[PDB]
Amino acid sequence: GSPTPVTAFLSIAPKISIFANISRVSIYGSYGATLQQIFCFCSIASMILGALAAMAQTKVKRLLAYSSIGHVGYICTGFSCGTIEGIQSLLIGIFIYALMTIDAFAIVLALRQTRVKYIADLGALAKTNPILAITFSITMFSYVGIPPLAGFCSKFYLFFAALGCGAYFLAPVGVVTSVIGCFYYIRLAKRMFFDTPRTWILYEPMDRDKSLLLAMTSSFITLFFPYPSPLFSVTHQMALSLYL
Amino acid sequence: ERVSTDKHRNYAVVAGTITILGALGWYLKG
Amino acid sequence: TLGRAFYAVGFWIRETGQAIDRLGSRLQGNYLFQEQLSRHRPLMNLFDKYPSVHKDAFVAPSASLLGDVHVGPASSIWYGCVLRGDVNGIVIGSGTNIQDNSLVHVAKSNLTGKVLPTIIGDNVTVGHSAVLQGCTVEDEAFIGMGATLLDGVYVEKHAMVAAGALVRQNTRIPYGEVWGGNPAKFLRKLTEDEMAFFSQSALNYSNLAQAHAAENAKELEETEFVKVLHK
Amino acid sequence: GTLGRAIYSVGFWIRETGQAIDRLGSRLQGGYFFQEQLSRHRTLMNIFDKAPVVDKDVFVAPSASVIGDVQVGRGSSIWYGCVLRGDVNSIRVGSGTNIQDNSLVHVAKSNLSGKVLPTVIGDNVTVGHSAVLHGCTVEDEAFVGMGAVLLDGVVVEKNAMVAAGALVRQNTRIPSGEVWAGNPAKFLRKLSNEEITFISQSAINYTNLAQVHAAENSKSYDEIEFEKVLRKKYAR
Amino acid sequence: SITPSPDRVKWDYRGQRKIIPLGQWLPKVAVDAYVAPNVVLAGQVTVWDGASVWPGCVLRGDLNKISIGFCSNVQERSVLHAAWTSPADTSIERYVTIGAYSLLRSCTIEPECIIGQHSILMEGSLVETQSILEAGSVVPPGRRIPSGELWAGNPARFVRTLTHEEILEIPKLAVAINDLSRDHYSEFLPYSTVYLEVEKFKKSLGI
Ligand SMILES: [Zn+2]
């Protein structure tokens, strides 16, 4: 319902803030199992819901909503235990999610007016605007998972930390919701050169600043793995100095 | 007929050249 | 393709030149660099396929010849021609008339090297509203107006194609033939006085073209320019 | 003020720098680029002495070359890309006519062996797109349009029409009220009376449209820029 | 009654401007399209994102709308002129390849059609879904050319039915023309640097 800038800001800005606040409280005023258990449940519930709802949607905004719920879920799975490696991977996931979602909203905002509310209006973006279609595919595959991207690297370090922290249960559900998401998305992308029912050649195209911001983040996503040392280092500094 | 006759634009241009000169000096003090 | 690299960096440099000039103009407080006016260079190139018109060959200032098009002396390109030479070149000999409202076209790129050239060999009249797409027309030819010559056609040596008629692919009109209608079918034979008349019309239009060009070189009439700047 | 004078000097300097950069770029290019010229195109011109005589209330699109002795009367229009070339013989078009864009009129055989051929277009004649008129006499209120072509001493008459491909040839006396077509031309209908009124109404409303296009196309740079900014701000 | 107003210009020193607004009806080209410099776009014409209107053409949609689709092309001396009152307009759909001397008053060309040279479309007619006219085609008023048919003759007639080779090859021809258009467009380089010419002219003559 809410307009696109409003919902973008609502997705990106408050979530990081409230996550930092949750971390600051859960380090200090928790119990042995109270908060960890009240989150361990919501994490699996979130991954499952993201999968089994985003699998079937017919509005390009609600799909974004359920994918956001899913990634918040993955982050909460990262929250499960309380070791340094775990919270490190937690913060890394938060950051990667912030970037990916400003990217996705850049796209869905540059595809706004002629497509007031539709998902079938991927009217040959492979043909009428190929670079934009490639960028959308990159952002989505990063949002879900594929060989080296940003989102895949983030989820992989999340599950690495989870396994090494003493929870052999979040990985199965996490990997299976990831793989159903991947099947669905990679079926959607490869559905972009079968045929095209509708066509919405667009007066929209990305004046200058949406284009620059997009280009920057999209170059970041693919090019993250060739040098992810400083992010790990700064996240280590942060998480280590959160309480110690 | 040898001048620019728009006050606001001229103030803005003074501000712009001041900006670029200041940035150059700042860099010179890196 | 080092030439094409030079061309591209030339575009970059000249484009920076235009931009810095416009910055200078905005600083100087003069927005005259917006007076939209049609470029329409009557002779135009693409990369190195510039036309080549011989001196003393009248080309109306409203024509449009672009691509590899070459044309020889005593020729006339009368107001409203489109001579395209992008893919395959156009060659046009001496003493020829390509009248107003005519294009000597070249088929947009077909897959194979099926893009035939177009040759228009001297002493040829090509009247008003004439489309010649990929053809071979030779000396002492008459193409009387309303004419269409589709790709693959060869007309030669004192031959006439009447009026308002089209000639399909792969058709040949040799000496002493007139074809007409849709499609172009053979009607009858010619007459020797008619052939001499072909030649005389060629010469008469050569003279007409001399006159028109000498008039088109008449110093641009500043009075109307200062008038239109007044109001 | 003095600040204005200073920045005027600075702007002139950097404009000179821009011109120099542009010449440097053309010289890095060269041999190939045909740099742009001024218009150097005549909307009206003479040949030997015959200047064109054009009504004041006419429309002439600035992409229509009238050359020779063209006598064009009132309430008419010579639309875009047109070529009225009567350099050899006389052209007189009636008042209230219209040459709908991208057409041509030429004459050939001035005063040879006694027989001459002028060219005349009657009143309220609406010749259409790509019409070729090569030495003809079209009486007033006659319809010719959409690619027709008349070859020789043809004379159309009194509400007759030739439509969409009519290649009319070699001294055809078109009957007074018919339609023709065919390549070559033959008749196939009877030209109903409401259709006669159609051609009349066509001439009239097309004169109207031509007046609109004139009022638009005859503007100066400052007025055009004003119109554009106003249109943008209003559509805002 | 032939009084010539001496204030009539005979050398406009700026050719027929490309984009002719007609009283708050600014015709619109997309930043990807390619119109020649000679062409004249007057009134309610829209060139949609990949089309090409080649040299020596005129589109004056002053009665109705004229809209060129995705990568359609309108060749050299075409004239598109919306017919009298109605909605009767001119729509050129996604992949249409018009001919050299095309004359279109009002009509609709549904996607993937090809029209040869010297084509005329009289007063409002449909040519739908992969139809191919031939050279010298003339479509009488109120005609419909159905799916996958090749027509010819004036007036138009039936010739044969299309083979799927040709029906699949039509968009290939469309995109080939679009690439040629890309070449010219890469050549044209905006702003034309003619204000320098008018400036030196004005300086040497007057001011
Ligand atoms: Zn002639």
JSON list of C-alpha atoms in Angstrom, two decimals, chain A residues 7-152:
[
{"chain": "A", "resi": 7, "resn": "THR", "atom": "CA", "xyz": [8.47, 1.36, 1.98]},
{"chain": "A", "resi": 8, "resn": "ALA", "atom": "CA", "xyz": [12.12, 1.37, 0.92]},
{"chain": "A", "resi": 9, "resn": "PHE", "atom": "CA", "xyz": [13.12, 3.55, 3.85]},
{"chain": "A", "resi": 10, "resn": "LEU", "atom": "CA", "xyz": [10.94, 1.44, 6.13]},
{"chain": "A", "resi": 11, "resn": "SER", "atom": "CA", "xyz": [12.69, -1.73, 4.99]},
{"chain": "A", "resi": 12, "resn": "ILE", "atom": "CA", "xyz": [16.29, -0.52, 5.15]},
{"chain": "A", "resi": 13, "resn": "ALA", "atom": "CA", "xyz": [16.67, 2.07, 7.91]},
{"chain": "A", "resi": 14, "resn": "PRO", "atom": "CA", "xyz": [14.64, 0.95, 10.96]},
{"chain": "A", "resi": 15, "resn": "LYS", "atom": "CA", "xyz": [15.65, -2.70, 10.69]},
{"chain": "A", "resi": 16, "resn": "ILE", "atom": "CA", "xyz": [19.39, -2.09, 11.10]},
{"chain": "A", "resi": 17, "resn": "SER", "atom": "CA", "xyz": [18.68, 0.26, 14.01]},
{"chain": "A", "resi": 18, "resn": "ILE", "atom": "CA", "xyz": [16.44, -2.18, 15.85]},
{"chain": "A", "resi": 19, "resn": "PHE", "atom": "CA", "xyz": [18.92, -4.99, 15.19]},
{"chain": "A", "resi": 20, "resn": "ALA", "atom": "CA", "xyz": [21.72, -2.99, 16.76]},
{"chain": "A", "resi": 21, "resn": "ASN", "atom": "CA", "xyz": [19.44, -2.27, 19.70]},
{"chain": "A", "resi": 22, "resn": "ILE", "atom": "CA", "xyz": [18.48, -5.94, 20.02]},
{"chain": "A", "resi": 23, "resn": "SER", "atom": "CA", "xyz": [22.15, -6.88, 20.05]},
{"chain": "A", "resi": 24, "resn": "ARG", "atom": "CA", "xyz": [22.94, -4.26, 22.69]},
{"chain": "A", "resi": 25, "resn": "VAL", "atom": "CA", "xyz": [20.18, -5.60, 24.93]},
{"chain": "A", "resi": 26, "resn": "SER", "atom": "CA", "xyz": [20.68, -9.32, 24.29]},
{"chain": "A", "resi": 27, "resn": "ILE", "atom": "CA", "xyz": [24.34, -9.06, 25.25]},
{"chain": "A", "resi": 28, "resn": "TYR", "atom": "CA", "xyz": [23.37, -7.44, 28.56]},
{"chain": "A", "resi": 29, "resn": "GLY", "atom": "CA", "xyz": [19.90, -8.21, 29.87]},
{"chain": "A", "resi": 30, "resn": "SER", "atom": "CA", "xyz": [19.11, -11.72, 28.65]},
{"chain": "A", "resi": 31, "resn": "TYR", "atom": "CA", "xyz": [18.67, -15.16, 30.20]},
{"chain": "A", "resi": 32, "resn": "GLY", "atom": "CA", "xyz": [20.42, -18.45, 29.58]},
{"chain": "A", "resi": 33, "resn": "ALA", "atom": "CA", "xyz": [17.78, -19.56, 27.10]},
{"chain": "A", "resi": 34, "resn": "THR", "atom": "CA", "xyz": [14.89, -17.06, 27.14]},
{"chain": "A", "resi": 35, "resn": "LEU", "atom": "CA", "xyz": [15.86, -14.68, 24.35]},
{"chain": "A", "resi": 36, "resn": "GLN", "atom": "CA", "xyz": [17.82, -17.27, 22.36]},
{"chain": "A", "resi": 37, "resn": "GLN", "atom": "CA", "xyz": [14.81, -19.59, 22.41]},
{"chain": "A", "resi": 38, "resn": "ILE", "atom": "CA", "xyz": [12.26, -16.88, 21.60]},
{"chain": "A", "resi": 39, "resn": "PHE", "atom": "CA", "xyz": [14.43, -16.12, 18.56]},
{"chain": "A", "resi": 40, "resn": "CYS", "atom": "CA", "xyz": [15.40, -19.68, 17.57]},
{"chain": "A", "resi": 41, "resn": "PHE", "atom": "CA", "xyz": [11.70, -20.30, 16.90]},
{"chain": "A", "resi": 42, "resn": "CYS", "atom": "CA", "xyz": [11.05, -17.12, 14.94]},
{"chain": "A", "resi": 43, "resn": "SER", "atom": "CA", "xyz": [14.10, -17.80, 12.76]},
{"chain": "A", "resi": 44, "resn": "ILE", "atom": "CA", "xyz": [12.87, -21.14, 11.43]},
{"chain": "A", "resi": 45, "resn": "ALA", "atom": "CA", "xyz": [9.33, -19.80, 11.20]},
{"chain": "A", "resi": 46, "resn": "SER", "atom": "CA", "xyz": [10.63, -16.90, 9.11]},
{"chain": "A", "resi": 47, "resn": "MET", "atom": "CA", "xyz": [12.70, -18.96, 6.70]},
{"chain": "A", "resi": 48, "resn": "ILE", "atom": "CA", "xyz": [9.81, -21.39, 6.19]},
{"chain": "A", "resi": 49, "resn": "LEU", "atom": "CA", "xyz": [7.31, -18.58, 5.66]},
{"chain": "A", "resi": 50, "resn": "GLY", "atom": "CA", "xyz": [9.52, -16.69, 3.24]},
{"chain": "A", "resi": 51, "resn": "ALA", "atom": "CA", "xyz": [9.94, -19.83, 1.16]},
{"chain": "A", "resi": 52, "resn": "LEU", "atom": "CA", "xyz": [6.37, -21.11, 1.15]},
{"chain": "A", "resi": 53, "resn": "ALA", "atom": "CA", "xyz": [4.90, -17.65, 0.50]},
{"chain": "A", "resi": 54, "resn": "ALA", "atom": "CA", "xyz": [7.32, -16.04, -1.97]},
{"chain": "A", "resi": 55, "resn": "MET", "atom": "CA", "xyz": [6.99, -19.25, -3.98]},
{"chain": "A", "resi": 56, "resn": "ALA", "atom": "CA", "xyz": [3.53, -18.02, -5.02]},
{"chain": "A", "resi": 57, "resn": "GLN", "atom": "CA", "xyz": [2.97, -14.28, -5.44]},
{"chain": "A", "resi": 58, "resn": "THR", "atom": "CA", "xyz": [1.59, -12.17, -8.27]},
{"chain": "A", "resi": 59, "resn": "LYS", "atom": "CA", "xyz": [2.59, -8.64, -7.25]},
{"chain": "A", "resi": 60, "resn": "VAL", "atom": "CA", "xyz": [6.18, -7.43, -7.53]},
{"chain": "A", "resi": 61, "resn": "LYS", "atom": "CA", "xyz": [5.93, -5.59, -4.21]},
{"chain": "A", "resi": 62, "resn": "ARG", "atom": "CA", "xyz": [4.62, -8.38, -1.98]},
{"chain": "A", "resi": 63, "resn": "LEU", "atom": "CA", "xyz": [7.34, -10.61, -3.41]},
{"chain": "A", "resi": 64, "resn": "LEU", "atom": "CA", "xyz": [9.82, -8.04, -2.11]},
{"chain": "A", "resi": 65, "resn": "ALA", "atom": "CA", "xyz": [8.06, -8.02, 1.26]},
{"chain": "A", "resi": 66, "resn": "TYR", "atom": "CA", "xyz": [8.28, -11.78, 1.67]},
{"chain": "A", "resi": 67, "resn": "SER", "atom": "CA", "xyz": [11.89, -11.86, 0.49]},
{"chain": "A", "resi": 68, "resn": "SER", "atom": "CA", "xyz": [12.65, -9.21, 3.13]},
{"chain": "A", "resi": 69, "resn": "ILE", "atom": "CA", "xyz": [10.94, -11.37, 5.74]},
{"chain": "A", "resi": 70, "resn": "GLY", "atom": "CA", "xyz": [13.07, -14.29, 4.57]},
{"chain": "A", "resi": 71, "resn": "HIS", "atom": "CA", "xyz": [16.35, -12.41, 4.84]},
{"chain": "A", "resi": 72, "resn": "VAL", "atom": "CA", "xyz": [15.43, -11.00, 8.25]},
{"chain": "A", "resi": 73, "resn": "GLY", "atom": "CA", "xyz": [14.88, -14.64, 9.11]},
{"chain": "A", "resi": 74, "resn": "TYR", "atom": "CA", "xyz": [18.32, -15.72, 7.94]},
{"chain": "A", "resi": 75, "resn": "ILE", "atom": "CA", "xyz": [19.79, -12.89, 10.02]},
{"chain": "A", "resi": 76, "resn": "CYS", "atom": "CA", "xyz": [17.85, -14.05, 13.07]},
{"chain": "A", "resi": 77, "resn": "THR", "atom": "CA", "xyz": [19.23, -17.56, 12.54]},
{"chain": "A", "resi": 78, "resn": "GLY", "atom": "CA", "xyz": [22.64, -15.97, 12.68]},
{"chain": "A", "resi": 79, "resn": "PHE", "atom": "CA", "xyz": [21.51, -14.51, 15.99]},
{"chain": "A", "resi": 80, "resn": "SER", "atom": "CA", "xyz": [21.01, -17.97, 17.51]},
{"chain": "A", "resi": 81, "resn": "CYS", "atom": "CA", "xyz": [24.16, -18.40, 19.58]},
{"chain": "A", "resi": 82, "resn": "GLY", "atom": "CA", "xyz": [26.30, -15.76, 21.25]},
{"chain": "A", "resi": 83, "resn": "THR", "atom": "CA", "xyz": [29.92, -16.28, 20.22]},
{"chain": "A", "resi": 84, "resn": "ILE", "atom": "CA", "xyz": [32.20, -13.75, 18.55]},
{"chain": "A", "resi": 85, "resn": "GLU", "atom": "CA", "xyz": [32.28, -15.50, 15.17]},
{"chain": "A", "resi": 86, "resn": "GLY", "atom": "CA", "xyz": [28.49, -15.70, 15.25]},
{"chain": "A", "resi": 87, "resn": "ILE", "atom": "CA", "xyz": [27.83, -12.02, 15.90]},
{"chain": "A", "resi": 88, "resn": "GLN", "atom": "CA", "xyz": [30.51, -11.17, 13.33]},
{"chain": "A", "resi": 89, "resn": "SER", "atom": "CA", "xyz": [28.65, -13.09, 10.65]},
{"chain": "A", "resi": 90, "resn": "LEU", "atom": "CA", "xyz": [25.43, -11.53, 11.96]},
{"chain": "A", "resi": 91, "resn": "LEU", "atom": "CA", "xyz": [26.60, -7.98, 11.31]},
{"chain": "A", "resi": 92, "resn": "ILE", "atom": "CA", "xyz": [28.05, -8.94, 7.93]},
{"chain": "A", "resi": 93, "resn": "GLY", "atom": "CA", "xyz": [24.66, -10.32, 6.94]},
{"chain": "A", "resi": 94, "resn": "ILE", "atom": "CA", "xyz": [22.93, -7.14, 8.09]},
{"chain": "A", "resi": 95, "resn": "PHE", "atom": "CA", "xyz": [25.19, -5.01, 5.90]},
{"chain": "A", "resi": 96, "resn": "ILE", "atom": "CA", "xyz": [24.86, -7.19, 2.79]},
{"chain": "A", "resi": 97, "resn": "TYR", "atom": "CA", "xyz": [21.09, -7.16, 3.24]},
{"chain": "A", "resi": 98, "resn": "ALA", "atom": "CA", "xyz": [21.00, -3.37, 3.46]},
{"chain": "A", "resi": 99, "resn": "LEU", "atom": "CA", "xyz": [22.87, -3.07, 0.17]},
{"chain": "A", "resi": 100, "resn": "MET", "atom": "CA", "xyz": [20.79, -5.70, -1.62]},
{"chain": "A", "resi": 101, "resn": "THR", "atom": "CA", "xyz": [17.53, -4.12, -0.58]},
{"chain": "A", "resi": 102, "resn": "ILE", "atom": "CA", "xyz": [18.41, -0.56, -1.58]},
{"chain": "A", "resi": 103, "resn": "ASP", "atom": "CA", "xyz": [19.39, -2.14, -4.90]},
{"chain": "A", "resi": 104, "resn": "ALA", "atom": "CA", "xyz": [16.12, -4.03, -5.33]},
{"chain": "A", "resi": 105, "resn": "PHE", "atom": "CA", "xyz": [14.10, -0.96, -4.44]},
{"chain": "A", "resi": 106, "resn": "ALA", "atom": "CA", "xyz": [16.10, 1.12, -6.91]},
{"chain": "A", "resi": 107, "resn": "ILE", "atom": "CA", "xyz": [15.00, -1.33, -9.60]},
{"chain": "A", "resi": 108, "resn": "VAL", "atom": "CA", "xyz": [11.35, -1.67, -8.58]},
{"chain": "A", "resi": 109, "resn": "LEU", "atom": "CA", "xyz": [11.18, 2.12, -8.34]},
{"chain": "A", "resi": 110, "resn": "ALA", "atom": "CA", "xyz": [12.68, 2.62, -11.79]},
{"chain": "A", "resi": 111, "resn": "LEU", "atom": "CA", "xyz": [9.96, 0.25, -13.01]},
{"chain": "A", "resi": 112, "resn": "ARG", "atom": "CA", "xyz": [7.08, 2.06, -11.33]},
{"chain": "A", "resi": 113, "resn": "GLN", "atom": "CA", "xyz": [4.48, 4.02, -13.24]},
{"chain": "A", "resi": 114, "resn": "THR", "atom": "CA", "xyz": [3.57, 1.99, -16.33]},
{"chain": "A", "resi": 115, "resn": "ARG", "atom": "CA", "xyz": [3.47, -1.05, -14.02]},
{"chain": "A", "resi": 116, "resn": "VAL", "atom": "CA", "xyz": [1.28, 0.38, -11.23]},
{"chain": "A", "resi": 117, "resn": "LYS", "atom": "CA", "xyz": [0.85, -3.13, -9.77]},
{"chain": "A", "resi": 118, "resn": "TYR", "atom": "CA", "xyz": [2.04, -6.18, -11.75]},
{"chain": "A", "resi": 119, "resn": "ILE", "atom": "CA", "xyz": [4.62, -8.99, -11.84]},
{"chain": "A", "resi": 120, "resn": "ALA", "atom": "CA", "xyz": [3.87, -10.26, -15.32]},
{"chain": "A", "resi": 121, "resn": "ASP", "atom": "CA", "xyz": [5.23, -6.95, -16.61]},
{"chain": "A", "resi": 122, "resn": "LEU", "atom": "CA", "xyz": [8.64, -8.41, -17.19]},
{"chain": "A", "resi": 123, "resn": "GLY", "atom": "CA", "xyz": [7.74, -7.68, -20.77]},
{"chain": "A", "resi": 124, "resn": "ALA", "atom": "CA", "xyz": [10.97, -8.73, -22.43]},
{"chain": "A", "resi": 125, "resn": "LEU", "atom": "CA", "xyz": [13.23, -6.58, -20.31]},
{"chain": "A", "resi": 126, "resn": "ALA", "atom": "CA", "xyz": [15.78, -8.93, -21.81]},
{"chain": "A", "resi": 127, "resn": "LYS", "atom": "CA", "xyz": [14.79, -7.40, -25.16]},
{"chain": "A", "resi": 128, "resn": "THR", "atom": "CA", "xyz": [13.65, -3.83, -24.48]},
{"chain": "A", "resi": 129, "resn": "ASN", "atom": "CA", "xyz": [16.35, -3.01, -21.91]},
{"chain": "A", "resi": 130, "resn": "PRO", "atom": "CA", "xyz": [18.88, -5.84, -21.58]},
{"chain": "A", "resi": 131, "resn": "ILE", "atom": "CA", "xyz": [21.30, -4.25, -19.11]},
{"chain": "A", "resi": 132, "resn": "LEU", "atom": "CA", "xyz": [18.46, -3.57, -16.70]},
{"chain": "A", "resi": 133, "resn": "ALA", "atom": "CA", "xyz": [17.26, -7.16, -16.96]},
{"chain": "A", "resi": 134, "resn": "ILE", "atom": "CA", "xyz": [20.77, -8.46, -16.27]},
{"chain": "A", "resi": 135, "resn": "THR", "atom": "CA", "xyz": [20.98, -6.15, -13.26]},
{"chain": "A", "resi": 136, "resn": "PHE", "atom": "CA", "xyz": [17.64, -7.36, -11.91]},
{"chain": "A", "resi": 137, "resn": "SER", "atom": "CA", "xyz": [18.74, -10.96, -12.30]},
{"chain": "A", "resi": 138, "resn": "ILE", "atom": "CA", "xyz": [22.01, -10.19, -10.51]},
{"chain": "A", "resi": 139, "resn": "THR", "atom": "CA", "xyz": [20.25, -8.49, -7.61]},
{"chain": "A", "resi": 140, "resn": "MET", "atom": "CA", "xyz": [17.69, -11.27, -7.21]},
{"chain": "A", "resi": 141, "resn": "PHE", "atom": "CA", "xyz": [20.17, -14.14, -7.46]},
{"chain": "A", "resi": 142, "resn": "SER", "atom": "CA", "xyz": [22.18, -12.32, -4.82]},
{"chain": "A", "resi": 143, "resn": "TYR", "atom": "CA", "xyz": [19.01, -12.00, -2.76]},
{"chain": "A", "resi": 144, "resn": "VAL", "atom": "CA", "xyz": [18.50, -15.78, -2.86]},
{"chain": "A", "resi": 145, "resn": "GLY", "atom": "CA", "xyz": [21.74, -17.58, -3.68]},
{"chain": "A", "resi": 146, "resn": "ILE", "atom": "CA", "xyz": [24.08, -18.63, -6.49]},
{"chain": "A", "resi": 147, "resn": "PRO", "atom": "CA", "xyz": [27.85, -19.10, -7.06]},
{"chain": "A", "resi": 148, "resn": "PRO", "atom": "CA", "xyz": [29.89, -16.20, -5.79]},
{"chain": "A", "resi": 149, "resn": "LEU", "atom": "CA", "xyz": [27.77, -13.15, -5.10]},
{"chain": "A", "resi": 150, "resn": "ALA", "atom": "CA", "xyz": [27.26, -11.07, -1.97]},
{"chain": "A", "resi": 151, "resn": "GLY", "atom": "CA", "xyz": [24.13, -12.75, -0.62]},
{"chain": "A", "resi": 152, "resn": "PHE", "atom": "CA", "xyz": [25.52, -16.23, -1.18]}
]
